[model samples]
Target chain A: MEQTYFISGANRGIGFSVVQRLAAKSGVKVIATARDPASATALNELAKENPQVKVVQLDISDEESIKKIAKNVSQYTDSIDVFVSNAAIAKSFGPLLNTPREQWIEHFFTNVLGPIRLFQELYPLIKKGTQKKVFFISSNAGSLNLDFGLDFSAFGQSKAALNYSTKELARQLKPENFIVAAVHPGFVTKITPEESAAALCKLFESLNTTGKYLSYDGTELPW
Target chain B: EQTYFISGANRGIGFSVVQRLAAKSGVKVIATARDPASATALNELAKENPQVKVVQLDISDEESIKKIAKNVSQYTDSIDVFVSNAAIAKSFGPLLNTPREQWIEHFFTNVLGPIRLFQELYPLIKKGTQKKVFFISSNAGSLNLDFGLDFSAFGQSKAALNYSTKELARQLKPENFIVAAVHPGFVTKITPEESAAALCKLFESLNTTGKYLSYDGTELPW
Candidate 1:
C-alpha cells in the first residue's frame, strides 16, 4: 500500500521543505503544488530526482485555481493520506489602525478562505485514505491569550479565523475519526526550513489527538 | 459627571443599552447612528430623556469615524464607559459556500470598525475617571462553544474581533483601563431590552482587563 501526501505552496520555504522530506521516504507519493510550476526551479529539480513526486500548479487565492488543482491531483492518486495546508499571504504587518481595508480582505482571502476551499475540494479524496489527517500552518501570533506586542493585526486576524474553522471542522469530522489540527511552526529562530520541516514531519507522525492547536514541539496551545 | 459612549444605538442591543444608561441620573449618554436624523426610536428616546444625545457614525468609514469622534468631543470632555456595540452579519453558510464579499464586509464592519473607533476615542477615554471599554461579541466567535451552525462568514470576523479585544486589553492594561469582550447571548425570543439590561449590569460589575465574558457576568474561554 502506497501512502500519498498532498502539500500546497510547495515552490519554496516550509512547503518546499516538507515536500523534500516526505519525498525522501520510499513507497510514498508526494503531490506538491506551486502557483507557477515553471518558476519553481528548486522544486522541479527535486521532483526530477524523486520519480514519485508530482509538482502541480496552484494559486490558493483563486477559487478556480483551487478547483483545478484538486481535479489535477486525481491523475496522480486516488486518495491522500495527509493534507498539509501551508499556503498563506503576509504582505502587510501593522496595527489594525495602520492596516488598510484592501490588506485585510486580501489576507483573509488567501490565508483563511483559500485553505477552506481547498479542504472542501479534497474532502472526498481525504475520506478515502487510511490516515484521514488535515493540518494547517498557523502561528503563535494568532493566539489571543499570548501577546508579544508585535503589530500583525491583519495576518494574525486571518490566522485566528483559520483556527476557528479548523476547530469547527474537527468537531464536524470527529465522528469519522479524522484528525484535524492547526500548528504554530515557531519563529524560525536559529533554524532552517529543513529543520522546521523535519520537526513538522515528526509532529505530523506523532498526532493522535484531534482538534488541537499545537506548537511544532508538540505542546498544546490556547485557543 | 459620568459620560457613556455607545455606537449603533438606532436599534437592537445598542439602542436598548442607550435607553438603560440614559435612565441613570448623572450619566450623559452619547449615542451614535449612521444617520441620526433618521433614527426615530433613538430620537424619541432622546427627546424624553435630555441626557441622551445622538451623533452620526458609520463605523467602517474612516472619515465617518473621525467626524463622530469630533462630534463626541463637543458633547463631553471625557467618556467613562465606551460600548462598541455596532456590528454586521451579512451572510451565513458553510465556509466553502460563503461568498468572498460577505467575508470582506463582515471583517470591515465587525473587526476593523472597532479598531478605528478605539483609536479615535482613546484620548477622551484616557481622561475619564473610570476607563472601561466593552465589545459586544458572540459565542459564534468562540472556538470552544459548539453552536452547530455554519456561521463561518460572520463568526470568523468575530473571532478576529476577539483577537483584537485581547490585544487592546494587553495594550491598555498598563494605564488602568478595563477592556473586555462580551457574548450577549443567543437571541432566542429574548428582547433586546432584556439583554441590554443584563449587559449594563455586567458592565457595572466588570473590574478586570483582557477577559472574555458572557452576558450573565461569567467568564468565557478564549
Candidate 2:
C-alpha cells in the first residue's frame, strides 16, 4: 500500500516546494491544498505532470473548508500517513509599537487558531491513518530568547502559543499513535526554496517522538 | 546613550531597577505600567528625572505589547536592554484550591506575557548595542529542588518559558546576542522590590554567555 500525505498551503512557497519533492517519490500520493483549486496553477500543473499528485481546495483558517477537505481525504484513503499544517501568515513584522491590532488578530487566527482548528477537525481521520505524524512549521523568530531583539510581535507570540498547544495536543493524542510536534525551520537567511524544503523534509523523516520542537537540521529546539 | 524598556515598572522589583537605571546618566528608561494614572510613584520619579518616560502598557494585551515596541522604536532605532519583569503572584494555595481561571491567568501573564513582549521588542534590541535579554524567573520554578509550595502553575509555566528562552539563546548566538534566565532569590513581599534591584544590578555587571543564574549572580543548575 502507498503512503498518503495531505499538505496544506500547497499552492505556493514552501508548501508547493514540499509537494513537488514528495510527488517525485514512488508509492506516495500527495493531496496538495490551496485556498482556491483554480488559482493553484503550479499545483495543478504538478498534478498534471505526476499521476500521484491531487490538488484539493483548503483554507486552513476556515473550519468548513478544512472539514470538506478532511472528508474528501477520508474518501481517498482510510488512513492518512502524514498531515502537515504549513499554511500560515507572516504579517507581524516591523517594530512592536507600530504593529496594528488587525495584524495581531490575523496572526493568531492564521498561525495559531487555524492549525488547532484543523487538527481538531481532522484528528479522527489522522487517528485512523498509519504513522500519524503532525507537523507544524514554526519559525526561529518565535523563539523568545532567539527573537529577543527582533520586532516579530504577533508572529512570535502566536508560535509560542502554538507550541504550548502542540504539547497539550501531543499529551491528549499520544494513545492514538499520533506524533504531534512543531519544527522551527531555522533562519534560512538567504537559502534557496529547495534547500529550505529539503531541510524540512529531512526533519520530518527523522522525528521519533511526540511533543518535541526541532529545527530543520534535526537538532531539538527549546520550546 | 542606552535605552531600557522595563515592564511592570510602577512598583515592585520593576520600579526599583527602573529607578536605578533612570538615575544613571546616559540612560533612557521607558517605564511601563498597567495603569499610568494610578502609578503615582513612577509619575513622581519621572518628574524628578528627565530621562524617565512613563508609557501605558498592559502586557496581557498583544496589541499593547506591539504598541510599546513601536513607540520605543520611534524614539530610538535600537533598545540596549529589555527586561521582562511584569508578572503576577496570586493564589498561593494548594493545587486543588487553585481555580482553572487563575491558572490560565498565571500562565497568560507570567509565562506568555514575557514571550509576547520579547517577540514584539526583540527586533529593536537586535539592532541595538549591549544585546542582552533577561528573563525574571524565580527559584520556585526550579524542578530539581523540591520547594514544596503550591507553585505548580507558576513553576510549570516558568519551566516552559525557560525552554523557550534557551532555544532562543541558541538560535541567536550566531548573531552575537546574549540571553540569560535569572532566578531572583526568595524575598519577602515587603522588600521584594529592593531584593530584585540588587539582583538586577548584579546581573547587569556580569558578562557571560548562555547561562541561567540566580539574582545574586550565581549560576543555577539547569
Candidate 3:
C-alpha cells in the first residue's frame, strides 16, 4: 500500500526534516502544512522538488484555520496513515513568582489544546487508514519524576498534559490498532533538526507498542 | 500568627476546611466562594465568626480572578497556606460519547484554574510564615490507579493538575516554600469535616515537596 503522512509545522525545524525524509520514499506521500505556505520559501522549495510533497497553510493554534485546511485532505487520500503532531512553541522565560497568566493560557492554547483540536479534526482520516498511528513530539521537561523543573514552567505543564492525553487516547483507540504515544527527542540542544527527524522516523518505522513514552534511543521513558 | 486562604470554601471540602481551621485557636481562615450573595452558609459563618473572612472568587474567568485578587489582599496582610481544593466532577463515560467542550472545560477549571491562582497569589503567600501550597487532586489521574480508560473528563484534567503541581513545586522549592498534590480519597466514604482535619494536620507535618499523597498522609503513585 502507498503510505501517506499528515504533518503539522512542516515549514521548518524537525517538521521540515520529517517531510523531506518521508516524501523521499517512493510510495509515500506527505501533506506538509505550514503556518503560511505562500511565505515559506524552504517548504515551497521542497514542494517544487518533489511531487510526493504537498504544501498547505495551517495555524495549529487557530481552530478556524484548521477547519478550512483540513477540508483539503481529499487532495491526497480520504485517509492518512500517520498524523504527526509536531507543532509547538516556547518563548521568554520569567520569574517563577511573577509569571503572567498569558503564558499558561498560551501554553494551553498552543501546546495542549492546539494538538487536541488537530487530533479531533484529523481522527476520521486516521480511522480510514490501515497504519493508524498518532505521534506527539513531547519532551523530558514534561516528566514528573524529574527533580528539575522548566524555567518557563507552562511549557512543561503543557507537555505533561499532552502526554496524559496521548496515553488516554491510546486506550480509546486500542481496538483499532492505532499506536498512540509521546516521544522526547533526546537532550535536544545537542542534536540537529535532521538528526531528530531521522531518529523519529526510525522509531515510527518499527513501533509496536501503544501508550509508550519513547526516547531518541528507541527505548521507552517514564511517562 | 496563622492564616490560610482556600478556594471553593462556600461548599464541600473547602467549607469544612474553613470551619475546622477557624475553630483552631490562634488561626484565621480566608474563605473564598464564587459569589458571596449565593453562598448563604459561608456568609452566615462570616457574620457570626470573627476568624472566617469570606471573599468572592470565580476560577474560570480572568477578570473575576483579577477582581478577587484585589479583594483577597485587602482581606488579609498575608496567607500562611493556600489550599487549591476546588474541582468539579462529571458522570463516567467513554471519550467517543463525550463532547470536546467537556474536556476543554475540565482542563480549564480543574487544571489551569489552580495554576492561574498560584501565579496570581504567590506574593501574598511568600510574605507569610508557612508558605505552604496544596492542590487537591483525585486517584483517577494516577497512571497506576486508573486502568482501562478515563471514563470522564475528571481524570485527564486531574492528571494535568498533578503535573502542574510537580513543575511548580520544583521551581518554588528553592524559595523556602513547599508545594504538593493530594488525592482526597473516596468522596462518599469520607466526610468533608474529617478529611479537612487530616489534611490540615498533614500540611503541618510536611517535611518535603513535589510528591503525590493520599488522604491519610500516605504517598500515592504519580
Candidate 4:
C-alpha cells in the first residue's frame, strides 16, 4: 500500500513545504489541509501538478469544523501513516507579565486542543494505518529548563502544556505501538521554511524511534 | 509604604497570610477574593484592622483580573510583596483515567493563573521596595519526588508553574526583582496560622533570587 501522510495547517510555512517535498516521493500520498482551501493559492499551485497531493479545508480551532473535515478526510483515504499537527497561533512578543488571559485561551485552544481533537476525530484512520506515527510541532521555549521563552510566554505555555499532554499520550498509546512525541522546529525561523521541512522529512523518514522528545537535528531533548 | 497583594485570600493559608501580614502598623494589605460580597469572614477580618482591605479578583476569569488590577492601582503606587499562592488539587487516580477537562482547568486556572497575575500586577510590585514575587508550589510539582497515580495532572501543571517561575526569575532579577517558588506545607501537621507566620517571616528576610524554599527556611531541589 502507498503510504499516506496527513498534515494540518498546510497552507504555508514548513507545513506547505513538507507537503511539497513529500508528494514527490514515489509510493507516497499526501493529504494537505488548510484553514481555507480557496485562498491557499501557493499550496493549490503545488497540488495541481502533483497527482499524490490533495488539498482540503480544515479549521482546527473549531470543533465542528474539525468534525466536518474529518468526514472529508474519509472520502480521500483510510488511515494516516503520518499525522502531523503544524497549526499554531500566537500573540506578538511582550513581557511575560503583560500577557492577558484571553491570549492564553486563544493560543491554548488552537495549539493544544487542536492537536488532541485531530487525534480523537481521526483515530480510526490512525488505527488502520500501517505506520501509526503522530508528530506535534512544539517549541524548545516550552522546555522546563529554558530561559529563552520569557518574552512570549503565552506561546510557550501552550507548547509546554502540549509537551506534557504529548508525553502522557505517548505513555498511554505505547501498548499499541503508536509512536508519539513533540518535535521542536528549533530556531528554524532564521532559515527558510524549506530547510525546516527538509529536516522534518528526514526525521519523519527515520521514525523507528518512539516515546521521546525530538529536536530538528533528530536528537532527543530533555522533557 | 509597604503594601502586600495576596490572591485567593478568602480561605485557607491565603486568608491566614492576609491576617498575619495585615496586623503590622506600617504595612497595608490588599486581600483579594474571587467574591467580595460573600466573603463575610474576610470582610470582618478587614474591619478588625484598618490596615487590611478586601478586594475582588478572579484569576480564572481574565477580564476580572484586569479590572482588579485597575482597582488595585487606586490603592497604592507600588506593592511591596506580590504573592502567587493560589492552587488546586485532584483526587488520586490512574494516569490514563485522568480526564482532560480537569487537566486543562488545573493547568490554566492554577498554573497559568499565577503567571498571569504576575504579568498584570508586576508593574506595581516593580516600583515597590521589596520587589518580591512568591509562587506557592507543591512538592508534587517536584519530579524527584514519587509520582502518585492520582497526582499526575496537578503535579505536571505545578511543575510547569515552577518552570515559569524559574524562567521569570532569570528574566526579572537583573531589574532588581526577586522571583521564587516555595512549598507551603499547610498540608503538614501545622495549622494555617502557623504556616502563615513562618512563610511571612521567611519572605521578610529573603535576599536570594532564583531560589526555591521550604516553609521552614530550608532550600530544596530545582
Candidate 5:
C-alpha cells in the first residue's frame, strides 16, 4: 500500500535524515518542508533524485506561511498519513532569569504554537488519511519529573507546553483512532541524525498507544 | 515568628491565603497585587490588619518585581514561605483554534512571571528561617492525566510552571530550600476560603521538595 508523509524542517539535521530515509522506501510519498526551499540545496538535490520526494516551503512561526501549507501540499498529495513536526527554536540556553520576555515569546512561537498551527492547516488532509499519526519532535528538557541539570529554561518551557498540547490533542483525537505523541530524540551527539531518524521511524511504526511521551528508544518518559 | 509572601493576593484563593496568613499569631503576611488601588478588598484588609502588608507587583513585569522586592525588603528582612499564586486562565479553546497572542500571553504571565519573581526574591528566601517556596499549579497541567478539556493555552502554561517548579527544587535543595508545585483542586465548586485554608494547612506540614502536591494532602503526578 502507498503511504504519504508530511515532515517539517527538512533542510537539515534530523528532519533532513527522516525525509531521506522515508523517500528511500518504495511506495512512500514524502512531502518535506523547509523554511527556505531554495536554500535547502541538499533536500532539493534529493528531490531531484527521488520521484517520491517533493519539497515545499514552510516557516512555521509565520501565520501566513502556515495558512498557505494546505494549498501548497495539495499539489503533491491529496492526503497525509503521517505528520512530523520537527522544526523548533532552542537558542535560549541559559537560566530562566537570563531569558527575556522577547526570547520566551520567540521560543514559544516557533516551538509550540507553530506546529500546532501547521497541524490545524493540515487537519483536512490528515482526517482523510488511513493512518492519522502526528508526531512532535520534543525534548527531555521539558520533563518536570526529572532534572537534566540543563539551563535551557525557555526551550524547556515551550516544549513542556508542546507536550501538554500533544496530550490534549491525543485525547481529542482518540475516538478517531488517531495516534498522536511527543518523542524525545535523546542527545544526538553520540549518534548521527540518520541513526536517530531510523530509530524514530521504527518507533513510529511500532507505537500502538497515544498521548505518550517516549524516547527514540521507545522508553516512556515522564511529563 | 514567620514572614509569608504571596503573589496575586488581590482576589480569590490568593486573597483568602493572605487573610488566613494574617489571622495567624506572630505571622507577617506580604500580599502582592498588580494594582493596589483597584484591589479594594486586599487594600482594605491591609489597612485593618497590621500583619498584612500589601505590595504592588505585576509578576509578569521584571521592573515591577524589582521595585516591589526593594519595598518588601523595608518591611521584612526575610520571607519564610513564598506562594506563587498569580496565574491567568483568560481563554479556553482547542489547540488549533487558540489565538497566537493568547498562547504568548499565557506563557509570559503564568510561566515566566513566577520565575522572574523567584529570581528577584531569592536573597530574601535565602535569609528566611523556614525556606519554603510553592507554585500553585493545576491537574490540567498534568500530561500523565487527562481532563479532556479545551484548556490548551492555560494547561500548557501550568505544565511549564511545573517544569520550572522541579528545576527550582533541584537548584535550591542544597541550600535547604523546600520548593514544590501544589495542585489546588477545582475551585469552581469549592469556596476560596476553604481551599486557601486547606492549602495553608498543607503548607504548614510540607517537608518534601520537587514533588507535585494536592490541596487535600495527597501526592500528584509530575
Candidate 6:
C-alpha cells in the first residue's frame, strides 16, 4: 500500500510547497486542502499534472469546515500516514502592548486552536495507521529564550502556547504509536519557496525519531 | 461558611485530610471521587456530616471538571479552598519498561488535571471569601533533586504542573489571591495516615509568601 499524506493550507506558501514535494514522491498520495479548492490556481495546476494529488476545500479558521473536510477525506481512505498542520497566520508586526485583542484571538484561533482541533478530529484515522508521523510547522521567532531584539510578541506568544500545547498533546498521544514533532523551517531570508521546500524535504527525510523541535539545518531547537 | 474542594478524597492520604476538614464546624466540603457510591468512608461521612457534598469527579476528564465547576457555582457563589490531591503511581519500574500510556495518564492526571480544575474554578475563587489555591505536588517533581530513581514520568508531570502553577499565579496576582504548590513529602506507601498528618502540619505553617513547601515546613527547591 502507498503511504498517504494530508497537508493543510495547501494552496500557497509553505503548505503548497510541502504538498508539491510530497506529491512527487513514489507510491505517495497527497490530500491537499485549501480555503478555496476551485480558485486555488497553483494547487489546481499541480493536481492537473500529478495523478497522486487530490485537492479538498479546507478553512483552518472554521471548525465546521475542518470537520466536514475531515469526514469527506475519511471516506476515501481509512488512515492518513503523515499529517502536517502547516496552516498558520503571521500577525502584523507590533509590540505586545500595542497589539489588538482581536489580532491575538485571530492568531491564536488560526495558529494554535486550529491544529489542536484538527488533531482531535483526525486522531482516529491517525491511530489506525502504521508509523504515523505528525508535524507542526513552527518558527524560532516564537522562542522566548532566543528573543534578542525581535518584537514578535503577538506571534511569539501564540507559537509559545502552540509549542506548550504540542508538548502536552504529544505526551497525551504518545501511547497510540504516533510520532509528533515541531519543525521550524528557518527564517528563509532571500530563499525561494522551492529552496525552502527542498530543505524541508531533506529535513523530513532525515526524521528517524519523534517528540523533537528541530530547525531546517537538522539542529534541534530549544523549547 | 467557607467552602473547600478535595479531589481523590476516597482513601489514603486524601481521605484522612478530608475527614479532618469535614469535622470542622460551619465549613462546606466538596468531596470528589470517580466512584462515589463505592467510597464507603466518604459516603458515611457525607451522611453524618450535613456540610459535606459528594460529587462525581474524574480528574482526567475535562468535561467532568467543567461540570463540577458549574455544579459548584450553582450551589455556592464561591470556593474558598481548592485542593488537587488526585495522583497515581504507574508501573513502578524502569523508564524503558514503563508503557507510554502510563506516561500519558500521569501527565493527564498529575499535570493537566490541576490546571483544568483551576482554569474552571479561578473565576469563582476570585469572587469568593478566602482566595487560595493549593497544589499537592511531590518532591520527586523537583528538577534539582537528582534522586536517580525511575521517576521520570512522575517528575516531568509534577514539574510541568509546578511551572503552570507559577504561570497562573503570576497572571492571578493582581487579584490579591495566594497560590502555592507544596511537595507533600515521600509518603511511605504503607503509612498514608502519618503522611496526611505531616502534610496537614506543613499546610498549617504556610506564611504569606506562597513559597514552595515540604511536609516539615521547609522551603523546597523549585
How does each model score on TM-score? 0.88, 0.57, 0.94, 0.85, 0.92, 0.55
| Model 3 chain A poorest ten-residue lDDT run | A91-100
DockQ of each model vs. true complex = 0.47, 0.07, 0.52, 0.30, 0.58, 0.04
Ten consecutive residues with minimal summed lDDT in candidate 2 chain A?
A142-151
Q: Name the candidate that leads on TM-score.
A: 3
DockQ of 3: 0.52
Q: What lDDT would each prediction earn against the true structure? A: 0.86, 0.73, 0.80, 0.78, 0.86, 0.71
Please tell me what DockQ candidate 4 reaches. 0.30
lDDT tens readout by residue for model 5, A1-223: 7999998999999999999989888889999999889999999999999989999999998999998999999999989999999989888876555666678778878998898889988988999899889999999888766565776677887888898888888888888898999999878748789999999889877888888899899999987
Which segments of model 6 are wrong by more than 4 Å? A1-9, A20-41, A49-180, A185-199, A206-211, B1-3, B22-28, B33-39, B46-78, B86-120, B127-130, B135-166, B180-191, B198-222
What would the TM-score be for candidate 3 when compared with the true structure? 0.94
- Candidate 2 docks at the CAPRI level of incorrect
lDDT of 4 by residue, A4-80 (tens): 99998889988998998897799888889998899999899988998788888888788778777668888889879
- What is the TM-score (0 to 1) of candidate 4? 0.85
Higher-ranked by DockQ: 2 or 6: 2
* Candidate 2: tens digits of C-alpha lDDT, residues B26-135: 99888889898999999998999958888878877766876887777656788777888788777454432444455456656776677778878878988988888888
Which candidate number has the best DockQ?
Answer: 5
Tell me the docking grade of candidate 5.
Answer: medium
Query: What is the total number of backbone clashes in candidate 3?
Result: 0
Model 1 lDDT per residue over A1-223, tens place? 6889999999998999999999888878999999999989999999998889999888989987986877799999999999999988878676554666678778878998788888988888999999999999999888766767776777888888899878777877888888999998777656788888998999987798788999888889887
**Rank list by DockQ:** 5, 3, 1, 4, 2, 6
Candidate 1's residue-wise lDDT over B154-185, tens digit each? 88888988987787787777889999999887
Candidate 6's displacement at residue B90, Å, is: 9.8
Q: Identify the superior model by lDDT, candidate 2 or candidate 5.
A: 5
- Expressed as tens digits, the lDDT of each residue in B74-108 for candidate 3 is 77878888889877887345554556677678877
